[PDB]
Amino acid sequence: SMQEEDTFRELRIFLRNVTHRLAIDKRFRVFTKPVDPDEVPDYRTVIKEPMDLSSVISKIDLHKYLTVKDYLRDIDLICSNALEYNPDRDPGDRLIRHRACALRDTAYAIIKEELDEDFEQLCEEIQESR
Ligand SMILES: COCC(=O)Nc1cccc(NC(C)=O)c1
């Protein structure tokens, strides 16, 4: 229905706003663009599904997310990839893991305060019907 298409458009507007607020935070600059395969040739041999905030914007615009649950799977993937690729005790690895956990926690906190639970339940019921 037109009403259902209006629901998914409101979801996309919400998701672009949350993603922009993450992408402008100085702590999360390392997560804003894909890892450059020229500068880090071993990245794609270790990390099987790369993800970053510019790719998340592209996916919103391609209508890849029909629920906030869908979207948070990709935020969780940015975080898990950082913990996997950078597991050591040295300061550079510990700084990127701290920033990855902050990105995940910040996304979940914005959604807790600003996503209506009945809006999410409506998106999940339309997705299930298709
Ligand atoms: C300056 O080197 C270019 C570069 O991007 N290196 C580099 C090294 C290790 C990790 C990461 N990024 C993530 C998201 O894990 C990036």
UniProtKB/Swiss-Prot annotation:
**Annotated compartments:** Nucleus
Organism domain of life: Eukaryota
- Expressed in which tissues: Highly expressed in estrogen receptor positive breast tumors and in osteosarcoma tumors.
The UniProt record describes its induction as:
Up-regulated in breast, uterus, colon, ovary, and stomach tumors. Induced in breast cancer cells overexpressing NCOA3 or treated with estrogen. Down-regulated in 5-fluorouracil-resistant derivatives of the colon cancer cell line HCT 116.
Which residues does the UniProt record annotate as the domain Bromo?
A: 3-114
Coiled coil (residue ranges): 108-130
Give the UniProt family note.
Belongs to the AAA ATPase family.
Q: What does this protein do?
A: May be a transcriptional coactivator of the nuclear receptor ESR1 required to induce the expression of a subset of estradiol target genes, such as CCND1, MYC and E2F1. May play a role in the recruitment or occupancy of CREBBP at some ESR1 target gene promoters. May be required for histone hyperacetylation. Involved in the estrogen-induced cell proliferation and cell cycle progression of breast cancer cells.
Q: How does it assemble?
A: Interacts with ESR1 and NCOA3 and these interactions are enhanced by estradiol. Interacts with acetylated lysine residues on histone H1.4, H2A, H2B and H3 (in vitro).
Name the chain's protein.
ATPase family AAA domain-containing protein 2
Species this protein is from: Homo sapiens
Name of encoding gene: ATAD2
